[PDB]
Coordinates of all heavy atoms in Angstrom, one line a residue:
Chain B
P11 N 132.4 149.8 45.5 CA 132.4 151.1 46.2 C 132.5 152.3 45.2 O 132.0 153.4 45.5 CB 133.5 151.1 47.1 CG 134.0 149.7 47.3 CD 133.6 149.0 46.0
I52 N 127.8 150.5 55.4 CA 128.7 151.4 56.2 C 129.1 152.5 55.3 O 129.6 152.3 54.2 CB 129.9 150.6 56.8 CG1 130.9 151.5 57.4 CG2 130.5 149.7 55.7 CD1 131.9 150.8 58.2
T54 N 131.7 155.9 55.2 CA 132.8 156.6 55.7 C 133.3 157.6 54.7 O 132.7 157.8 53.7 CB 134.0 155.6 56.1 OG1 135.0 156.3 56.7 CG2 134.5 154.9 54.8
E55 N 134.4 158.3 55.1 CA 134.9 159.4 54.2 C 135.3 158.9 52.8 O 135.3 159.7 51.9 CB 136.1 160.1 54.9 CG 137.3 159.2 55.1 CD 137.3 158.5 56.4 OE1 136.3 158.4 57.1 OE2 138.4 157.9 56.8
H56 N 135.6 157.7 52.7 CA 135.8 157.1 51.4 C 134.6 156.4 50.8 O 134.6 155.3 50.4 CB 137.0 156.1 51.4 CG 138.2 156.6 52.1 ND1 138.6 157.9 52.0 CD2 139.1 156.0 52.9 CE1 139.7 158.1 52.8 NE2 140.0 157.0 53.3
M59 N 129.5 151.7 51.3 CA 129.6 150.4 50.7 C 128.8 149.4 51.7 O 128.8 149.6 52.9 CB 131.0 149.9 50.6 CG 131.2 148.7 49.8 SD 132.7 147.8 50.2 CE 132.6 146.3 49.2
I61 N 128.6 145.8 53.4 CA 129.4 144.6 53.7 C 128.5 143.5 54.2 O 127.4 143.8 54.8 CB 130.5 144.9 54.8 CG1 129.8 145.4 56.1 CG2 131.5 146.0 54.3 CD1 130.7 145.5 57.3
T76 N 129.8 126.3 69.8 CA 129.8 125.0 70.5 C 128.5 124.2 70.4 O 128.5 123.0 70.3 CB 130.1 125.2 72.0 OG1 129.1 126.0 72.6 CG2 131.4 126.0 72.2
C94 N 120.1 127.7 67.9 CA 120.9 128.8 68.4 C 120.4 129.3 69.7 O 119.2 129.4 69.9 CB 120.9 130.0 67.3 SG 121.8 131.5 67.9
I95 N 121.4 129.6 70.6 CA 121.1 130.1 72.0 C 121.5 131.5 72.3 O 121.2 132.0 73.3 CB 121.7 129.1 73.0 CG1 123.2 129.3 73.2 CG2 121.4 127.6 72.6 CD1 123.7 128.8 74.5
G96 N 122.2 132.1 71.4 CA 122.6 133.5 71.5 C 123.9 133.7 72.2 O 124.2 134.9 72.6
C97 N 124.8 132.7 72.4 CA 126.1 132.8 73.0 C 127.0 133.6 72.0 O 127.4 133.1 70.9 CB 126.7 131.5 73.3 SG 126.5 130.3 72.0
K98 N 127.3 134.8 72.3 CA 127.8 135.8 71.4 C 129.3 135.6 71.0 O 129.9 136.5 70.4 CB 127.7 137.2 72.0 CG 126.5 137.3 73.0 CD 126.4 138.6 73.7 CE 125.3 138.5 74.7 NZ 124.8 139.9 75.1
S99 N 129.8 134.4 71.3 CA 131.2 134.0 70.9 C 131.4 134.1 69.4 O 132.5 134.3 68.9 CB 131.5 132.6 71.3 OG 130.9 131.7 70.5
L101 N 130.5 136.6 67.6 CA 131.0 138.0 67.4 C 132.4 138.1 67.8 O 133.1 139.1 67.3 CB 130.1 139.0 68.2 CG 128.6 139.0 67.9 CD1 127.9 140.1 68.6 CD2 128.4 139.1 66.4
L102 N 132.9 137.2 68.6 CA 134.4 137.2 68.9 C 135.2 136.5 67.8 O 136.4 136.5 67.8 CB 134.6 136.5 70.2 CG 133.7 136.9 71.4 CD1 134.1 136.1 72.7 CD2 133.9 138.4 71.7
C104 N 134.2 136.3 64.0 CA 134.1 136.9 62.6 C 134.8 138.3 62.6 O 134.4 139.2 63.4 CB 132.7 137.0 62.1 SG 132.5 137.9 60.6
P105 N 135.9 138.5 61.9 CA 136.5 139.8 61.8 C 135.7 140.8 61.0 O 135.8 142.0 61.2 CB 137.9 139.5 61.3 CG 137.7 138.4 60.4 CD 136.6 137.5 61.0
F106 N 135.1 140.4 59.9 CA 134.3 141.3 59.1 C 133.0 141.8 59.8 O 132.7 142.9 59.7 CB 133.9 140.5 57.8 CG 135.1 140.0 57.1 CD1 135.0 138.7 56.5 CD2 136.2 140.7 56.9 CE1 136.1 138.1 55.8 CE2 137.3 140.1 56.2 CZ 137.2 138.9 55.7
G107 N 132.4 140.9 60.6 CA 131.2 141.3 61.4 C 130.0 141.4 60.6 O 129.4 142.5 60.5
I109 N 127.3 139.3 61.4 CA 126.4 138.6 62.2 C 125.8 139.5 63.2 O 126.5 140.2 63.9 CB 127.0 137.4 62.9 CG1 127.2 136.2 61.9 CG2 126.2 136.9 64.1 CD1 127.9 135.0 62.5
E110 N 124.5 139.6 63.2 CA 123.8 140.5 64.2 C 122.8 139.7 65.0 O 122.1 138.8 64.5 CB 123.1 141.7 63.5 CG 124.0 142.8 63.2 CD 123.2 144.1 62.9 OE1 121.9 144.0 62.8 OE2 123.8 145.1 62.7
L111 N 122.8 140.0 66.3 CA 121.8 139.3 67.3 C 120.6 140.2 67.4 O 120.6 141.2 68.0 CB 122.5 139.1 68.6 CG 123.7 138.1 68.6 CD1 124.2 137.8 70.0 CD2 123.3 136.8 67.9
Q123 N 109.4 133.4 75.4 CA 110.1 132.3 76.1 C 109.3 131.9 77.3 O 108.3 132.5 77.7 CB 111.5 132.7 76.4 CG 112.3 132.9 75.1 CD 112.5 131.6 74.3 OE1 112.4 131.7 73.1 NE2 112.7 130.5 75.0
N125 N 110.8 130.8 80.8 CA 111.2 131.3 82.1 C 112.3 132.4 82.0 O 113.5 132.1 82.0 CB 111.7 130.1 83.0 CG 110.7 129.1 83.1 OD1 110.7 128.0 82.5 ND2 109.7 129.3 84.0
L126 N 111.9 133.6 81.8 CA 112.8 134.8 81.8 C 112.0 136.0 82.3 O 110.8 136.0 82.4 CB 113.3 135.1 80.4 CG 114.4 134.2 79.8 CD1 114.7 134.5 78.3 CD2 115.7 134.4 80.6
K127 N 112.8 137.0 82.7 CA 112.2 138.3 83.1 C 112.7 139.4 82.3 O 111.9 140.2 81.8 CB 112.5 138.5 84.6 CG 112.7 140.0 84.9 CD 112.5 140.3 86.4 CE 112.9 141.7 86.7 NZ 112.8 142.0 88.2
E131 N 110.8 137.8 78.0 CA 111.8 138.4 77.2 C 111.8 137.8 75.8 O 111.5 136.7 75.6 CB 113.2 138.2 77.9 CG 113.5 139.1 79.0 CD 115.0 139.1 79.5 OE1 115.7 138.3 78.9 OE2 115.3 139.8 80.4
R133 N 113.2 136.3 72.2 CA 114.2 135.4 71.8 C 115.1 136.1 70.8 O 114.7 136.6 69.8 CB 113.6 134.2 71.2 CG 114.6 133.3 70.4 CD 114.1 131.9 70.3 NE 115.2 131.0 69.8 CZ 115.0 130.0 68.9 NH1 113.8 129.9 68.3 NH2 116.0 129.3 68.5
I134 N 116.4 136.1 71.1 CA 117.4 136.7 70.3 C 118.1 135.7 69.5 O 118.6 134.7 70.0 CB 118.4 137.6 71.1 CG1 117.7 138.5 72.1 CG2 119.3 138.4 70.2 CD1 116.7 139.4 71.4
Chain D
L3 N 122.0 144.6 74.5 CA 122.6 143.3 74.6 C 123.5 143.2 75.9 O 124.2 144.1 76.2 CB 123.5 143.0 73.4 CG 122.9 142.2 72.2 CD1 122.8 140.7 72.5 CD2 121.6 142.8 71.7
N4 N 123.4 142.0 76.5 CA 124.1 141.9 77.8 C 125.6 141.8 77.6 O 126.0 141.0 76.8 CB 123.6 140.6 78.5 CG 122.1 140.3 78.3 OD1 121.3 141.2 78.6 ND2 121.8 139.2 77.8
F6 N 129.4 140.7 78.5 CA 130.0 139.5 79.2 C 131.5 139.6 79.2 O 132.1 140.1 78.2 CB 129.6 138.2 78.5 CG 130.1 138.1 77.0 CD1 131.2 137.4 76.7 CD2 129.3 138.6 76.0 CE1 131.7 137.3 75.4 CE2 129.8 138.5 74.7 CZ 130.9 137.8 74.4
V8 N 135.4 138.5 79.0 CA 136.1 137.4 78.3 C 137.6 137.6 78.6 O 138.0 138.6 79.0 CB 135.8 137.6 76.7 CG1 136.6 138.8 76.2 CG2 136.1 136.3 76.0
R64 N 128.7 133.4 79.9 CA 128.7 134.2 78.7 C 127.4 135.1 78.6 O 127.3 135.9 77.7 CB 128.8 133.4 77.5 CG 130.2 132.8 77.2 CD 131.1 133.8 76.4 NE 132.5 133.4 76.4 CZ 133.0 132.5 75.6 NH1 132.3 131.9 74.7 NH2 134.3 132.2 75.7
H65 N 126.5 134.8 79.5 CA 125.2 135.6 79.6 C 124.5 135.5 78.3 O 124.2 136.5 77.6 CB 125.4 137.0 80.0 CG 126.1 137.2 81.3 ND1 125.5 137.9 82.4 CD2 127.3 136.8 81.8 CE1 126.3 137.8 83.4 NE2 127.4 137.2 83.1
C66 N 124.1 134.3 77.9 CA 123.4 134.0 76.7 C 122.0 134.7 76.7 O 121.3 134.7 77.7 CB 123.2 132.5 76.5 SG 124.7 131.5 76.9
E67 N 121.6 135.2 75.5 CA 120.3 135.9 75.4 C 119.2 134.9 75.5 O 118.2 135.1 76.3 CB 120.2 136.7 74.2 CG 121.0 138.0 74.2 CD 120.1 139.1 74.8 OE1 118.9 138.8 75.2 OE2 120.6 140.2 75.0
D68 N 119.2 133.8 74.8 CA 118.3 132.7 74.9 C 118.9 131.6 75.8 O 119.2 130.5 75.4 CB 117.9 132.2 73.5 CG 116.7 131.2 73.5 OD1 116.2 131.0 74.6 OD2 116.4 130.7 72.4
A69 N 119.0 132.0 77.1 CA 119.8 131.2 78.0 C 119.1 129.8 78.3 O 118.0 129.8 78.6 CB 119.9 131.9 79.3
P70 N 119.8 128.7 78.0 CA 119.3 127.4 78.3 C 119.1 127.2 79.8 O 118.1 126.5 80.2 CB 120.3 126.4 77.7 CG 121.1 127.2 76.7 CD 121.1 128.6 77.3
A72 N 118.2 129.2 82.2 CA 116.9 129.8 82.6 C 115.7 129.0 82.2 O 114.8 128.9 83.0 CB 116.8 131.2 82.1
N73 N 115.8 128.4 81.0 CA 114.6 127.7 80.5 C 114.5 126.4 81.2 O 113.3 125.9 81.4 CB 114.7 127.5 79.0 CG 114.6 128.8 78.2 OD1 114.5 129.9 78.8 ND2 114.6 128.7 76.9
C75 N 115.3 125.5 84.3 CA 114.9 125.6 85.7 C 113.4 125.9 85.8 O 112.8 126.9 85.3 CB 115.6 126.8 86.4 SG 115.1 127.1 88.1
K81 N 117.0 134.6 86.6 CA 116.3 135.7 86.0 C 117.3 136.7 85.5 O 118.5 136.6 85.9 CB 115.4 136.4 87.0 CG 114.3 135.5 87.6 CD 113.6 136.3 88.7 CE 112.6 135.4 89.5 NZ 111.5 134.9 88.6
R82 N 116.9 137.5 84.6 CA 117.7 138.7 84.1 C 117.3 139.9 84.9 O 116.3 140.6 84.5 CB 117.5 138.9 82.6 CG 118.3 140.0 82.1 CD 118.4 140.0 80.6 NE 118.3 141.3 80.0 CZ 118.1 141.5 78.7 NH1 118.0 140.5 77.8 NH2 118.1 142.8 78.2
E83 N 117.9 140.1 86.1 CA 117.5 141.2 87.0 C 117.9 142.5 86.4 O 117.1 143.5 86.4 CB 118.1 141.0 88.3 CG 117.8 142.1 89.3 CD 116.3 142.3 89.5 OE1 115.6 141.3 89.6 OE2 115.9 143.5 89.6
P105 N 126.4 124.7 78.2 CA 127.5 124.0 77.5 C 128.9 124.5 78.0 O 129.8 123.7 77.9 CB 127.3 124.3 76.1 CG 126.6 125.6 76.1 CD 125.7 125.6 77.3
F106 N 129.0 125.7 78.5 CA 130.2 126.2 79.0 C 130.6 125.8 80.4 O 131.7 125.9 80.8 CB 130.3 127.8 78.9 CG 129.8 128.3 77.6 CD1 128.8 129.3 77.5 CD2 130.4 127.8 76.4 CE1 128.4 129.8 76.3 CE2 130.0 128.3 75.2 CZ 129.0 129.3 75.1
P164 N 128.9 143.7 72.9 CA 128.8 143.0 71.6 C 128.1 143.8 70.5 O 127.7 143.2 69.4 CB 128.0 141.7 71.9 CG 127.1 142.2 73.1 CD 127.9 143.2 73.9
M167 N 131.6 146.6 69.4 CA 132.7 145.9 68.8 C 132.4 145.5 67.4 O 133.3 145.5 66.6 CB 132.9 144.6 69.7 CG 134.1 143.7 69.2 SD 134.3 142.3 70.2 CE 132.8 141.3 69.7
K168 N 131.1 145.2 67.1 CA 130.8 144.9 65.7 C 131.0 146.2 64.8 O 131.4 146.1 63.7 CB 129.3 144.5 65.6 CG 129.0 143.8 64.3 CD 127.5 143.6 64.1 CE 126.8 144.9 64.1 NZ 127.4 145.8 63.1
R171 N 134.7 146.5 64.2 CA 135.1 145.5 63.2 C 134.7 146.0 61.8 O 135.4 145.8 60.8 CB 134.6 144.2 63.5 CG 135.2 143.6 64.8 CD 136.2 142.5 64.5 NE 136.8 142.0 65.7 CZ 136.3 141.1 66.6 NH1 135.1 140.6 66.3 NH2 137.0 140.7 67.6
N172 N 133.5 146.5 61.7 CA 133.0 147.0 60.4 C 133.8 148.1 59.9 O 134.2 148.1 58.7 CB 131.5 147.4 60.5 CG 130.6 146.2 60.7 OD1 131.0 145.1 60.6 ND2 129.3 146.5 60.9
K173 N 134.2 149.1 60.7 CA 135.0 150.2 60.3 C 136.4 149.7 59.9 O 136.9 150.2 58.9 CB 135.1 151.2 61.4 CG 133.8 152.0 61.7 CD 133.9 153.1 62.7 CE 132.6 153.7 63.1 NZ 132.0 154.4 61.9
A175 N 137.2 146.7 58.7 CA 137.1 146.0 57.5 C 136.9 147.0 56.3 O 137.5 146.8 55.2 CB 136.0 145.0 57.5
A176 N 136.1 148.0 56.5 CA 135.8 148.9 55.4 C 137.1 149.7 55.1 O 137.4 150.0 53.9 CB 134.7 149.9 55.8
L177 N 137.8 150.1 56.1 CA 139.1 150.9 55.9 C 140.1 150.0 55.2 O 140.9 150.5 54.4 CB 139.6 151.5 57.2 CG 138.8 152.7 57.8 CD1 139.7 153.4 58.8 CD2 138.4 153.6 56.7
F179 N 139.5 147.5 53.2 CA 139.1 147.2 51.8 C 139.3 148.4 50.9 O 139.7 148.3 49.8 CB 137.7 146.7 51.8 CG 137.3 146.1 50.4 CD1 137.6 144.8 50.1 CD2 136.7 146.9 49.5 CE1 137.2 144.2 48.9 CE2 136.3 146.3 48.3 CZ 136.6 145.0 48.0
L180 N 138.9 149.6 51.5 CA 138.9 150.8 50.7 C 140.3 151.3 50.4 O 140.5 152.0 49.4 CB 138.1 151.9 51.3 CG 136.6 151.8 51.2 CD1 135.9 152.7 52.2 CD2 136.1 152.0 49.8

Side-chain angles (χ1 to χ4, degrees):
Chain B
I52 173 170
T54 185
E55 64 269 14
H56 313 325
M59 192 206 177
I61 59 168
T76 65
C94 176
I95 77 158
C97 46
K98 331 176 188 199
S99 77
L101 300 191
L102 313 179
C104 174
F106 306 136
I109 284 180
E110 278 195 353
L111 294 186
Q123 296 294 141
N125 303 102
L126 283 171
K127 146 159 173 183
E131 279 191 1
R133 168 157 191 224
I134 310 303
Chain D
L3 266 286
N4 323 306
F6 64 97
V8 76
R64 288 270 169 84
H65 301 241
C66 319
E67 282 275 358
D68 192 0
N73 291 5
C75 178
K81 300 174 189 295
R82 179 163 142 195
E83 177 59 40
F106 309 128
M167 182 179 72
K168 196 191 65 50
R171 294 254 174 82
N172 288 355
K173 289 185 186 295
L177 287 199
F179 193 86
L180 283 166

